[model samples]
Target: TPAPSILELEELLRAGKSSASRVDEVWPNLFIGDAATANNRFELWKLGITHVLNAAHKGLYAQGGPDFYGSSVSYLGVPAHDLPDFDISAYFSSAADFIHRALNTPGAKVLVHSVVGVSRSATLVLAYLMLHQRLSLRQAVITVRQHRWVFPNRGFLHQLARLDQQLRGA
Candidate 1:
């Protein structure tokens, strides 16, 4: 398997437009917090977002029914890996796959969200940034933090560093 990235920089990679707008939204794509309020969904649509990437540990199916107010809801379930003691390696492949699928979506923008637009969601987004944008782990995390003020779970950040070093064979 390909070594995991500091962030999945694919969005920057496949940015067909080449030099599009930087992600200025709180949640990179169109990430909404816990429940997707109609207003939030409208905001997403208004911004031209068509997809959502939810990282709520245990898929929404496990969370019961969809409380989503968004019309076009798609679930790429990523369980939170924010435990004080957790294994990010275990989730690396799945995380990469989630990002791959999300970024590859055609004709729709992706919104990555967790409970607070921080932590798990941020970690995933960071990884996506590194992998897709070719940014350093530190660089990616810093940028995301600059935008959202959420640390990508210390454990996750450490794991990202490890993954980055491993990939670089440093």
Candidate 2:
């Protein structure tokens, strides 16, 4: 099989259902959701979420800091921008490590969210899958899309591809 181009990846995302609920578990105990879902404490408890990664946290948006989650949930913020030019790759290793450690913890369920859960948050989740799970970018997309619709922008796709290349070399 050949590696997919960025256009091909976009088409794959487009071909899949382009919709999801406020939150969807794209992997076992790993959720992808919007800011609204992230803010809903009751809903998080209902889903048994133990950890949160806010990809669009603070700076250009309202803060979803530790104060909001209190001591109940473990929280990590990425402060990412959805712009194609933004360097989302910078957080890949750290975000991937956070998710890796979270999942390895006993009974830990992680919720990764951005404003819409389809861009910045989705990109980090994809990067995590590729980094920690040893999945290719295409494989990560296929795995995540199986549970929820997600669209990481073109620049994110480029960064992910670079990561894929680096991982393959390793």
Candidate 3:
């Protein structure tokens, strides 16, 4: 199928809300996007989104674009680091803070993204699901993949492992 436009994507989102509800039953308060696009603001506007829970560092997401970029409040920005050096804990506080903002921001749809809209985004999405839904790390991944094909990078999985260990106190 053709890559869905922002409006089409929102329609898909609406269509998937039930699946999300089911996932929420298992891993509450989490949603996933099909793919990332440059017109993120367009999607948010059409979706009635007020906040965007971004995962990339300020250098990338905050680089300044058009009016759309300035409209929403971005939560956290993890610097693009090498796999061996990437650390989820390094930015966990910011990530959690952004989600909190999303919860508070009325009509907000937390939109997490990375360069490819897969790795870091998926890890962060999964992390949010794990924390908010009270699911284990494994459940988080499984739950998200159930709705869409989530293929986070090895580095992203490393982040998941770290988050898992931190939550488990292992």
Best by lDDT: 2
List the candidate numbers ranked by lDDT, top first: 2, 1, 3
Ranking 2 against 3 by TM-score, winner: 2
Over 1-170, each residue of candidate 3 has an lDDT whose tens digit, in order, gives 22223343233323332332211111233344433542455655655444544555546533222243555544445565435457755665567566665666665555555555545666677677666667666656556655654456555566666677677674
Which window of 10 residues has the lowest lDDT sum in candidate 2? 61-70
The runs of at least 3 residues in candidate 3 whose Cα sits more than 4 Å from the true structure, single-residue gaps closed, are 1-40, 58-75, 82-84
Off by over 4 Å in 2: 1-3, 60-71
State every prediction's TM-score relative to the real structure: 0.64, 0.90, 0.64
Q: Candidate 3's error at 16, in angstroms? A: 15
Clashing pairs in 3: none
lDDT of 2 by residue, 1-170 (tens): 44568998997777665666888999889999998998888878888888888999885423243445433357788889899999999998888888998899999899999999899999999999988897988889888887778889889888888888788763
Shift of residue 30 alpha carbon in model 3, Å: 5.1
Please report the candidate that would top TM-score against the real structure.
2
lDDT (0 to 1) per candidate: 0.55, 0.84, 0.52
**41-73 per-residue lDDT for model 1 (tens digits):** 666667665555566656432222233566454
Model 2: lDDT equals 0.84
lDDT of 1 at 21: 29
